[PDB]
């Protein structure tokens, strides 16, 4: 692993506008010949690329980000194209010192690794159990716990970065608890439609609270909630490439503005425990 305060050059996939956190999984599917070639060499060259926390995506302005290390690589060939699907985990946060694009179009970023309250954890843990009671997979260390919380939380991207700037685990834990106290989400374009609340979130899996899935190119972050409001389902369930196995999906849509706020999931077998659960896209929701 890269040393603290070091300065190295790490590739930037120009498509990603997600804000990754150390320990946050990123699913990627690459169709472009260049991006594919970059990952292949990178697979031999430490499998480490850069995920920037863009402030203004239009200008592509990010002051910091986190490193992502590839752990899965599978190659396919569809419609005459060579495609690559890779999975990578956040490893180390960094601060952007420089970023210039080489002649080949390969965007590289030179960055500096940023160096690495028990009752505050537990009190924060009690606040999470109030919204949903579950069985632990939650981490023991305070460092890891601050990151998992930052990833699995309905956070605005503005505040998502603000917790990456914090270099103290105890400070991350303290700032994160203040937000959980600060209640419900809403439709972005509307800003009036109230969709769900913190009491509805739950975890189908260990990383259940929030996780990411690829567009069968686009990468969505989907919040799992038990019930929802003010959203119309459209059509009938389909079992095609259900992001959650054994469930069928139907597109949800805002009643007022018709923005696609997510999907509604339904068990193909009565045996499954969360019979009714909703997947909601983070990009379509703004916290109140
Ligand atoms: Zn709306």
Residue numbers in the entry: 72 to 187, 250 to 268, 271 to 317, 319 to 352, 354 to 425
From the paper:
The ubiquitin E3 ligase cereblon (CRBN) is the target of therapeutic drugs thalidomide and lenalidomide and is recruited by most targeted protein degraders (PROTACs and molecular glues) in clinical development. CRBN consists of an unstructured N-terminal region and three folded domains: the Lon protease-like domain (Lon), the helical bundle (HB) which facilitates binding to the adaptor protein DDB1, and the thalidomide binding domain (TBD). We present the design of CRBNmidi, a construct that readily expresses from E. coli with high yields as soluble, stable protein without DDB1.
Next, we successfully crystallized CRBNmidi protein and determined its crystal structure to a resolution of 3.11 Å. As with CRBNΔN:DDB1, the structure shows CRBNmidi co-purified with a Zn2+ ion bound to the zinc finger of the TBD. The compact closed conformation was likely selected for by the crystallization process as, unlike for ligand-bound CRBNmidi which produces large numbers of hits, we only obtained a single crystal for apo CRBNmidi indicating that apo CRBNmidi is recalcitrant to crystallization in its flexible open conformation. In addition, as CRBNmidi is purified in the absence of DDB1, the additional stabilisation of the open confirmation through interactions between the sensor loop (residues 341–361) and DDB1(residues ~776–780) that was previously observed by Watson et al. cannot take place in this structure, and is likely a contributing factor to observing the closed state.
